[PDB]
Structure 1
Amino acid sequence: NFRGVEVEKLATMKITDILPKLNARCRRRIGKHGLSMKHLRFVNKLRLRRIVRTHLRDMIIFPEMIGMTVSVYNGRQFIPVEIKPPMVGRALREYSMSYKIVSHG
């Protein structure tokens, strides 16, 4: 369960209703104008909602897009990323690694 509200009362009340919540990176980046090439990301994602291969790693995820599958570039390939409730408040670059973990040898 999200901070104090259940999924119905932040994903239906207001898109910015969560800002009194999530951390200072979120308030800073949203008290700043989002670049005009990721609004198109939402009028391609939320629009035609009824799998997207994307290329913007730094993009704050906010609740209205929940339960989606995306494929984010990490430099060599697109990696699928699912959307569970706790993903809200984070960026997309934390969910696809650009390095394979070392092993023995």
Structure 2
Amino acid sequence: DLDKLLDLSQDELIKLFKARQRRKFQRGISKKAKSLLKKIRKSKKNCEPGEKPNPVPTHLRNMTIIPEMVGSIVATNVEIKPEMIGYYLGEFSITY
């Protein structure tokens, strides 16, 4: 289930993902996303597991969900799950 996802590397991760995410991850990750990943791993390593973690400031709608950053929310409280990984973020104004 999730142990293999969290241990296995990025090329087999894109193989798991659709070819859309394969193309995206091959062509670009960039400094913004790498710094975002470092921030999220620090926040998840410091925040208590007994409470769900905090959202990501400097919000963006084009960050792909990767199992190596579990727990995060956005600042619209849907949690990014293993069934959420390939759908990107979205989560914007849709109020009826």
Normalising by structure 2, report the TM-score. Answer: 0.75
Are 1:69 and 1:81, in contact at CA under 8 Å, matched by a contact in 2?
no
Mapping for residues 15-26 of structure 1, pairs under 5 Å: 15-26=10-21
Gapped runs of 5+ residues in structure 1?
Answer: 1-5, 72-77
Give, in whole Å, the separation in 2 of the partners of 1:9 and 1:89: 17
- Could you say which structure has the higher strand fraction? 1
Gapped runs of 5+ residues in structure 2?
Answer: 47-53
Query: Which amino acid in 1 is paired with 2:73?
Result: V
| Bigger Cα Rg | 1
**CA RMSD, Structure 1 to Structure 2 (Å):** 1.8
Give, in whole Å, the separation in 2 of the partners of 1:99 and 1:8: 34
Given candidates 51, 61, 64, the residue that maps to 1:60 is 64
Matched residue SS, 2:60: coil
- Could you say which structure has the higher helix fraction? 2
Could you tell me how far 1:57 is from its partner in structure 2?
A: 0.7
Q: Which runs of 4+ in 1 moved over 2 A?
A: 13-17, 78-81
Give, in whole Å, the separation in 2 of the partners of 1:53 and 1:21: 26
Query: Which amino acid in 2 is paired with 1:92?
Result: L
Deviates more, 1:37-46 or 1:52-61: 52-61
Give, in whole Å, the separation in 1 of the partners of 2:56 and 2:13: 27
Q: Percent of aligned positions with the same letter in both sequences?
A: 26
Query: Is 1:80 aligned to residue 77 of structure 2?
Result: yes
- What is the number of residues matched between the two proteins? 87
